[PDB]
Design a protein around this ligand. Structure first.
Ligand SMILES: O=c1[nH]cnc2c1ncn2[C@@H]1O[C@H](COP(=O)(O)O)[C@@H](O)[C@H]1O
Ligand SMILES: O=c1[nH]cnc2c1ncn2[C@@H]1O[C@H](COP(=O)(O)O)[C@@H](O)[C@H]1O
Ligand SMILES: O=c1[nH]cnc2c1ncn2[C@@H]1O[C@H](COP(=O)(O)O)[C@@H](O)[C@H]1O
Ligand SMILES: O=c1[nH]cnc2c1ncn2[C@@H]1O[C@H](COP(=O)(O)O)[C@@H](O)[C@H]1O
Lengths: 476, 476, 476, 476
């Protein structure tokens, strides 16, 4: 009976501690920000965007991946809508490197314009038979503008020129070379039998230049994760997401230490033995252990620290985030697995503390909530523009009247491009890691130490006794 | 001499702790909210409304009982007024299942309309003799509208039809059946000699449907408690209340660890050996022990935590509520008795903490203070409507000029129906208990543990860094 | 070297602790508020008014004494002015019970009106010779109105009636009897030789009725203390004050643990071996010991807690008041001497904590600062009236430009009569002592215990979550 | 692995502690404020002005030195500009006591007016040959006004009078005597061969009177320090500064516990074996040790406490200042070296705490930021005048767009002359040291102790419950 151990212990939150400076042999610009979450999941920056309908849609998942992070597409939409959202992220870069779009000569140019405008593409590979996939040509914009009547076989108006192709598996470096020698923009990839396997474009090559640290899969396509809950349509949902290309699924739950959740997760794992599973939230060592034991690959920590979260107020449950991460990370290392610090982070400095306490990555909602990419609804008050930001446990989100919320509905100032937000936080992360001499996150877990501060020390830590009219892009 | 133990120890209040999540095998919707306070007192929800003249009158006592709770009628009124207030609660449902109203043929229809409008009833059972109680008929509204001159014997204008009755003790299920077969709304209950014992109505049956979790007595009448102090008119008051139907009395005192209070309580118990006694406030283990030893059944904990309480400021006395509940609950279990956590609760989450620290029920004042049912006086400021809320130790309350107050006078925003307030708090209670895996309050005492948080952790616990224009019905 | 004990320990201030309720056998109205500070100094209430030029002049010293307390006349004025201020307090009640005013027949009625209007009196005892003091008569208002030309011997216009007198030493009870039988208002007291020793009046008898708990000396005259510093004019000042009637002097210093102060105090004691000495401020056990060892009777505790004090901010020195009182009171009991808790008290509850931590009395400045009696200057802002309140270490006070202040200049709202302020605080003191069961201050030191509270607990202790538009006379 | 010692310990900031009063045998006006930082560096007051482009230029370095302190000229300017800034401080008093300005008869009066107006001087010593330096005369204002055409040899218009001189090495006391007997204002110093070595003026003698406690070098010239970073132009910079007269250089770094910084410092020391080196910031015992071991003479402590500093927020790194000073001072004494408490000081009381925790001097930025001398830019808001104050890590400062700041840009109210600010802080320092009985800073380290206070105690420490409309020059 814990009646005699009713008051267990004290917990620390980001504002109770500071990282202590230490000898350092690594400059901020040379710290390694990569983090491997699972065999299949390694990110170039320890940053992940929350699965919230006001933060992560395909645009955000695309922007955070290009920056080297991971986006988790929210499940507050139909399985079909969420899967298509996921496909959009996979189709972004090297979109058709595999599983290309294509039509037959039989089809009508109209159908070609249908998919050229639906998936927004300059050309459509044309194969003899949808089943044979033997490349016979390709229809392009130039072709569509020359064409008068679209109600005709895409054949009559074609490109039966001397097809220039490359073997399956040619990389971007060699394709760029081939595209340059032939003054072309699209390079179809076919096997030794002329069967179409995919297509490489000049843009793909350019995007590699534009976003050098993008987190991508084996095919050079941006990584993406998607969330699902523990309901009757979970499998259906999970299989639709994986089939759309998801590199991992996130079983998002309010209480991950629930028998039911553990039951469903084991069933999900039993069905997807190879896939990467990230699971719901816990804030204790046993909760992390229960989830790992259930087959999860990555455990997300966080009960109540959310900016828009009212769990601690309405249910009276939770644990200060720095302590929760730490207690859970003790198990993550026992199992040689990973953890995501989820919530309560408001400053770049908080990210370094969350990582130093044992996190392998942090999930951010509030910090991205008002960007160009975030799906939130724009509002104007006092002339300034805002972006709605609501907890998934709020009334509006839990919608299709109030029905016992664990979160609130709010809004945050317009922040502009997410790439800028990310750039500001990485600088703080690199500086933080430079101060404690951590060349990589591993050293951070092993060497970084905290000094506890009081409310006054927190005051000293923030700028004080000075009137600020123009704030820093990394401080309020 | 405690001079060497002047600084005894540290105390915790609701905002210093959080309940730690734990493995759970019970969903929120299946947690058991019942709580037995005494052999005679079991509630369907661990909620009780404060004995304050701005919170609990008969309307509130009726609403909280229908929801499964208990209302404590305040004593800031004459003994006669408080007793009638109590009768109103007993007469609400199955109001005349026993001790029915009745008149004789002799009486004048006028007297019948007198009691039909005083107690608001559609019919008046008519007996041959007030002493014989032999049912001879019943006068109804239809009868009153047909009647021209009321200054006449209720006989001349009557209902000497074929009386349809049921034996004493027939339950609502069988009465409903009888009422339906005879297309009637009132079913008189008589003994084998035709003597009237009570009456069952169609509404009674309907109210059982409308409020399925109502806390009721052996007769299916809503439960109710009433408060009394320790003065010379206490006995007179207590006996008037019990005689009106009170299921328990609350000896409400500022300092329950007083020799005088203990003296009076023992005298009250010596006189009412069977009755359920709930007693004044204490905040220590010895105070609870002194009261239990004096014969009390349920001890209420709380010295100074009240929203409108100034005891800690003007007298400088008190103890942080979570510690007080806990220290007292240690004794409650030694004696195998119960405790009510009284005051300082502002959020549904606080209720779960109060219960987890050892409370068997919580008493709420502020949270109900501005509802439809609360007796407070309405005020308008800035266009919005408010409801006065004053401590019973304030000047105005202590009235029939300032006379050394231990509390203040205030007001709170209009909250609408109390049933809605209750519904919001139960949801939070069920979620809280779900997180720690407590299927019932007992498991809550035995298994739930607290983690201590600092001021910063409290900040993290509440929503932050987000502009809220539309709040949740369960958070501010 | 304390370099290894640089961080000595933690200190508590009034807002860190609460008194724990305990069994009680004494009602608030029967608690004993008396406190003996020294053989010569016993007060009826443990309250003393600060020696500040904006708080204690003769009017305040008179009002607090009538209530049973002690007033300390400030030294921010000439020795002559301070002594006369002191005489005014002694002349208030039984003003001429000894050392009466008197003139000879020789004098001119003009001189009689001079002193009748200077000291405001209805009559002037007239003696044959200033040196003989043989009562020959008495001139009264009635006499002055009958008199046309004042430039004449008070003899020509006289009262050589049958003198009614009483022997030296007759008390008020017997004098009242004599005054009543002779229908007179003034009763001269003479020795067996007709020599005038003093005079008793009807008012004196009435004032005993009006203020039953007044703190008075052996002659039934109100008690009074006066402050002096440690300078070259100290002796001159101290002897002028004692000669005016001071029952005690207060050697007020910023740092009482100074070699110089201890030197001067010992010299003051060596010169006044019988007198009651109260000395400067200390906040440690050794400081209290140094002062006691120097010959002081009562030590006042307090370095930095003052509402208008900036010592802790500008010098960075001080110790939380509850800890200081306690550390010093440990020595006070070793020496069997007393302590005054000086400063930082803002609520009546704070008084009980200060007494419970070891204080024998508390000195209040801020709480009396805006009363009728306080010498502060009235100011009007937003229509409301204020009363200036400045620390004696502020610039303005240290005046005859800024010259390195240890305190600030401020103002407080007009509070009305001090008797009302006192009445509100005693009620809280009696309630506080009732809760812990302390029948007298001694039991308070021996039995009362503190429970430590956090910032949150402090929040819980004060009224919260309620809009207050009309405050209590004992809370803000 | 510190993974098991992740939460190292608690840190204290100025607002967590208070100095405890102690027996004292020294009055404030007799405390010794001198502090020796190095063999070559002893200040008359433990105060140094921050190397910030909005706080310390030559004017400030001049004012703080005259007061007995040390000014550190910031490096946010070209090496040439910073060196000239430094020369200005050396030329202030006894400006030409050595290395005097001079011209030949050959030169044109025009060139004489060029340097008389560039360096603002009443006269120009004239020597036969720039290489011989044999004094032949001196041109003065009177001479320039008599002269019509400046395009002529300074010879034609001269002062070949009977030259009055003094031997090299004559002090101000004897020079004053010589200047007085000859009714002259400038006294050339020449060797036994008539070679000019320098010049003493009446003003120099007057400035000794005007600023009696000025911190000066062996030649009676004000002391001055200058900052440099760890870059490729450091040596060039350091040698330019020393050559301009710098008495010490400050290697200012964000993280002084960096391998690179330690490398550069050792190289700087290896090159300047005699010079006084003050180095970057650390907040740990090892960091101080690493720097001392690298050859630094004085270590400055402080990571994150700055008013305009955001290091703790954006990087999440730092340590409460009182703890940092103390941990570092433990090493300073092991090595018998010194420390400068850098940042987080807002009140004079904070200076005493910083010194008591082990500092030998404190560096102040914010407190001087809006003075006459501070280089900040003036701004007007609401009619009042402000002075910009920005962290050297802010965007604007890091300028020649945002580029990952560790500090912010702000402004502070106009404060008037710095001499007044200094005067207010010394008074508080002397009072603070008087309370703990510290006759000098050494006793402060050895005897002073701290008592820890809570948030409430901090409240008690500051003025409270009083409306202040006119603040003290030493408190807000
Ligand atoms: O209504 C809610 N209640 C509790 N947690 C929520 C709610 N909505 C989102 N969250 C979680 O809390 C985190 C808050 O992130 P933040 O806004 O950056 O602090 C998200 O990643 C979600 O896991
Ligand atoms: O004037 C008063 N002083 C102290 N306690 C009071 C006073 N008036 C009511 N109370 C008590 O404090 C509780 C406050 O409940 P709350 O407003 O919900 O926090 C009530 O149940 C009463 O027991
Ligand atoms: O300028 C000042 N500095 C420090 N203490 C002061 C000053 N002026 C008065 N005091 C002291 O502090 C106490 C403050 O009382 P309060 O205003 O009731 O808190 C007075 O009794 C004096 O002993
Ligand atoms: O942008 C910045 N980040 C961190 N420290 C800074 C920055 N600018 C100046 N400082 C340092 O912090 C101190 C702050 O002094 P203060 O304003 O008096 O608290 C200065 O002496 C510098 O060492």
């Amino acid at each position: 009976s814990n009646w005699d151990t009713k008051f267990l212990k004290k917990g620390y939150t980001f504002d109770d501690v500071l990282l202590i400076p230490a000898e350092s042999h690594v400059l901020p610009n040379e710290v390694d920000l990569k983090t491997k979450l699972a065999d299949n999941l390694t990110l170039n920056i320890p940053i992940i965007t929350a699965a919230m309908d006001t933060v992560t849609g395909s645009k955000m998942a695309i922007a955070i991946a290009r920056a080297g992070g991971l986006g988790v597409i929210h499940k507050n939409m139909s399985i079909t809508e969420q899967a298509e959202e996921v496909r959009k992220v996979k189709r972004s870069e090297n979109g058709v490197i595999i599983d290309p779009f294509f039509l037959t000569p039989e089809h009508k140019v109209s159908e070609a314009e249908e998919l050229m405008q639906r998936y927004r593409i300059s050309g459509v590979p044309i194969v003899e038979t949808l089943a044979n996939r033997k490349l016979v040509g390709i229809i392009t914009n130039r072709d569509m503008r020359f064409i008068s009547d679209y109600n005709a076989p895409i054949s009559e108006h074609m490109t039966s020129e001397h097809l220039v192709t490359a073997a399956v598996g040619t990389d971007l470096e060699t394709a760029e070379r081939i595209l340059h020698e032939h003054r072309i923009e699209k390079l179809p990839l076919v096997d030794n039998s002329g069967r179409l396997s995919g297509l490489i474009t000049i843009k793909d090559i350019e995007k590699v230049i534009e976003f050098p640290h993008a987190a991508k899969d084996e095919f050079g396509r941006l990584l993406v994760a998607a969330a699902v809950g523990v309901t009757s349509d979970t499998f259906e949902r999970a299989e639709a997401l994986f089939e759309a290309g998801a590199d991992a699924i996130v079983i998002d739950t309010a209480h991950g230490h629930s028998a039911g959740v553990l039951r469903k997760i084991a069933e999900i794992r039993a069905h997807f033995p190879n896939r990467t599973l990230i699971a719901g939230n816990i804030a204790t060592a046993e909760g992390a252990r229960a989830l790992y034991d259930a087959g999860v690959d990555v455990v997300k920590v966080g009960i109540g620290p959310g900016s828009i979260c009212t769990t601690r107020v309405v249910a009276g449950v939770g644990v200060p985030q720095v302590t929760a991460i730490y207690d859970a990370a003790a198990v993550a290392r026992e199992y040689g697995k990973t953890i995501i610090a989820d919530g309560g982070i408001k400053y770049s400095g908080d990210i370094v503390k969350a990582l130093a306490a044992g996190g392998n990555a942090v999930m951010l909602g509030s910090m991205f909530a008002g960007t160009d990419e975030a799906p939130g609804e724009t509002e104007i008050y006092q002339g300034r523009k805002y972006k709605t930001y609501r907890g998934m446990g709020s009334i509006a989100a839990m919608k299709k009247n109030k029905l016992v919320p664990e979160g609130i509905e709010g809004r945050v100032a317009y922040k502009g491009a997410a790439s800028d937000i990310v750039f500001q936080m990485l600088g703080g992360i690199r500086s933080g890691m430079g101060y404690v001499g951590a060349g990589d996150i591993q050293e951070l877990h092993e060497n970084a130490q905290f000094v506890e501060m009081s409310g006054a020390g927190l005051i000293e830590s923030h700028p004080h006794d000075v009137q600020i009219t123009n704030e820093a892009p990394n401080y309020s």
